[PDB]
Write a protein that binds this DNA or RNA. Structure first.
Lengths: 67, 89, 103, 58
RNA sequence: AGAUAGAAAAUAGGUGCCCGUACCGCAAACCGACACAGGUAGUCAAGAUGAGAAUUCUAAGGUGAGCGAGCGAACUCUCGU
RNA sequence: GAGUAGCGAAAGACGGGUGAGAAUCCCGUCCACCGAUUGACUAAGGUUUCCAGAGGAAGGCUCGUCCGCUCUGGGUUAGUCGGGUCCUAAGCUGAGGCCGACAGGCGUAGGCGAUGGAUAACAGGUUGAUAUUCCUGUACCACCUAUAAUCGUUUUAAUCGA
RNA sequence: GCUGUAAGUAAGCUUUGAUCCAGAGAUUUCCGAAUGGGGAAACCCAGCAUGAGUUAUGUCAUGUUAUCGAUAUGUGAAUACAUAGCAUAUCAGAAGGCACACCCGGAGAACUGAAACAUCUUAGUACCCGGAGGAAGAGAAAGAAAAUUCGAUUCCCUUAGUAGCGGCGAGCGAAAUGGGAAGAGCCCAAACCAACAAGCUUGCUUGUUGGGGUUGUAGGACACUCUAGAGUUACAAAGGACGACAUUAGACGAAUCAUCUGGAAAGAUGAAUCAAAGAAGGUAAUAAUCCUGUAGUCGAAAAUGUUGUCUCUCUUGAGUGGAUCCUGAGUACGACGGAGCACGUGAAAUUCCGUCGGAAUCUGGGAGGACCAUCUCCUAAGGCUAAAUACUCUCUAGUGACCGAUAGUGAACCAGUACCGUGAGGGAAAGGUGAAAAGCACCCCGGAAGGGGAGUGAAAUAGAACCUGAAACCGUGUGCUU
């Protein structure tokens, strides 16, 4: 789902990643407390954060290449 | 950071007895110090911690079937916050 | 090779000269389960997930080498080829024209 | 232990006896320590006495 | 020697990290292939008797030894006369 | 070989209970052994043998309901204790350097390295397992911030220092 | 359709192209040459800069901070200049690893053979170390030959177990010629020099700037006269710009039905078919026609080796005189002591190393196995150089009168692992249910392990220690004996 992420402004990408940290922490915390019952809901956010950091790297490769 | 170090909470009869008091128990990363745990918890839950204690557990032998293994090394921290209440719901 | 839901005849095993629609493919072992083929009698034990049990009569898989598609025009057992309609590998009954595999 | 000019260095061979009984031996150069002009600034180094026969400035 | 306009003083608030911490340790968790009569540094070490950390009995505290039940021949082993 | 040798120093008896099963497991009474120790600590070493449930194939020189065995889940909390942090001995390394067929050996300045020197917390309570670590009480050592009751050429000072 | 092995039960993902498969890129914790300091690798403790945090301290993040090298500036002793020496900055400079192979060097055994043993042999072997390169070494004649020169090198066959060397014992052991693989010659010093930078007074000269020409028909300058192809594999040396096949995904691909026995046919029987495909492997048994394929054909976004060119970049070709000049110095070579060459300081001429000596410059020097005289050949003492050649950790495709689990690797199976040892090291044993897990619902004895029915299956003395199941060995019956 990395199209709109390319469409994002590179400034709320940090915001999106921070929210993803928050939600992953909450859901894992309530997994170890035995209150989660949504396992595919961990790998999906791991996908999301992985894609968000890959796009973030590609973003800063530009100024490295251009400047 | 400040969320990657609190791996999980610890729930058990001794942890439950500690929770009778304001002491909460967590399973933290293996490369952190007391100060960083204090900061992380008081950043997340908005609590004010008074002290924290850390201990390192050695890898334990575990045989699964015919293959022997070792469990992962653990680092556990105990907080004793004053005001506040880490809710583990 | 055959498709997930087409109707095929069987030529091996106690079941030959019999038709039936395929219900699963399992392409990692090229074994298909056709309906009404290889009926099995499995002894299932009373557990927790299954309250009781008994002798279930489920269908078992057979090698893809034991089934064949029927000519949609003449129900004639046939092989299967291909042709490039708009660059798409669509199937042919190899004795007549196009053969449809939609479900 | 080489010369800084020629390169005359040591070499191995055999000490042979009257009964042609052989033992390993060595042959060293007549290396002498002399202060010569290495790249201008004078320096002490080993130089053979055949290289000093004619050609070196102490 | 230098270095510098600064805090000591008689307070009141805070901050103090990493590693080890279980368990055995004259021992069935150690070195001896063994739940082996061997070896394994140091600390505390009570009462009666005594010169004594000797000896016999006992306190604090541990323990009854991972095979037994008979019969009480020969013959070995340990012990008494 | 043979159902033979061996069953690895020693004091057990009995009532109750548990179980498919008990000389052998749990409780109790009596008896006995050690007691400059078979007692309590703490090192080295071993690493989970520690604790609570459960099991009985195997391991326990017999049996076994038992265990240092197996399965499950747990358990080690320090500014002050021992180290790191501070110091150095014996040794080991050693920039440059000396010597060396190559390899490399030796060695200065300097480093590393306790078995030594210097360093601030005591008592009581506490669970099944930890406690100069946790909690109650009372302390102490460093460091930082706010304040200072006037120390006073900031050379000297309230006093800063190789 | 998928979420490895690994079963599962759970949450899911996917035709909106995911899953997967290739190409490319990004992330890539800690230790290790290990490089900020230390250290019992996978751990500790920091300086500096910059940022986060806190009222601040503690704390954290990211760069950076080893040692050598070279280059460049600072500064600069004992001492006067100046040198050590210090202090910085820069640079994909060096380190380490390995294929147990191959190659070139440095160093260098011994058991053994001589039916003893010392010379000699094993042997320039093994083991060490230092370099490498994908190949390396060698290489364009001071070379063989009495030729009519293969006109550089290497390598293969033969010469030939010949010539020879050998306490003439053991035993070592060529080379030339000839037949083949391969089809390469190339640059610098020296003379000399237009011009110039520096001491000289431009008379003499210095230079690396550069030209010059590099060879025995004796080559070159010299003086004449004369005229503008190469190549990045040596022969200077860089890199864009177009194509061409091939290779790191893939695609299409002919033609079979019936009966019989069976648990199942591919078998048997009958009738067909295809073949540029009857290689091969699967499939419930033995398949050209069922499946994967095969012959044939087709096919890359990309990232690569490779190659045609187009550029591009380089650039003098001869003759004739020959008066002078030049043609590789502590060198050849000799003596002493050693090694090497099939050949034992020896004739060692051929050739090297240590130690002393020590030459000629064409009207010269070296070689032709003591040797010389004459003849013939060559022209040292500077350098570069592809091919034929050696080997396989790999990768790709394939082959085998090679092994089929005491074999074949040690290892078909979580193997350099159990285990053993302080360590170097040493090192195992262990494959097979069935077609399909259909892996035995229930009942009965038993605490359980087991079992006995029933059921699955062709078969359950195929029930998981599971195909066949021998012998040793242990039992239970008994016919005949004692």
């Amino acid at each position: 789902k990395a199209k709109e992420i390319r469409d994002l402004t590179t400034s709320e990408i940090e915001e999106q990643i921070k929210s993803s940290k928050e939600e992953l922490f909450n859901l894992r915390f309530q997994l170890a407390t035995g209150q989660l019952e949504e396992t595919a809901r961990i790998r999906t956010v791991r996908k999301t954060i992985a894609r968000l950091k890959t796009v973030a790297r590609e973003r800063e490769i530009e100024q490295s290449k251009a400047n | 950071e400040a969320r990657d170090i609190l791996k999980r909470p610890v729930i058990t009869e001794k942890s439950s007895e500690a929770m009778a008091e304001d002491k909460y128990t967590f399973d933290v990363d293996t490369r952190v110090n007391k100060t960083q745990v204090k900061m992380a918890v008081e950043e997340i839950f908005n609590v004010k911690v008074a002290s924290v204690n850390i201990m390192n557990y050695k890898p334990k032998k575990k045989r699964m079937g015919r293959y022997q293994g070792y469990t992962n090394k653990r680092r556990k921290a105990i907080v004793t916050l004053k005001e506040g209440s880490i809710d583990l719901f | 090779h055959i498709k997930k839901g087409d109707n095929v005849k069987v030529i091996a095993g106690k079941d030959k000269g019999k038709e039936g629609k395929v219900i699963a493919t399992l392409p990692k072992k090229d074994r298909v389960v056709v309906e009404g083929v290889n009926i099995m009698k499995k002894h299932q034990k009373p557990t927790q997930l299954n309250p009781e049990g008994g002798i279930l009569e489920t269908e078992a898989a057979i090698h893809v080498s034991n089934v064949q598609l029927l000519d949609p025009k003449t129900n004639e057992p046939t092989r299967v080829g291909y042709k490039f309609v708009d660059g798409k590998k669509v199937r042919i009954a190899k004795k007549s024209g196009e053969e449809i595999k939609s479900n | 232990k080489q010369c800084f000019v020629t390169g005359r260095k040591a070499s191995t061979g055999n000490r042979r006896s009257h009964a042609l009984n052989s033992t390993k031996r060595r042959w060293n150069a007549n290396l002498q320590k002399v202060r010569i002009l290495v790249d201008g600034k004078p320096k002490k180094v080993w130089v053979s006495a055949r290289a000093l026969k004619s050609g070196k400035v102490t």
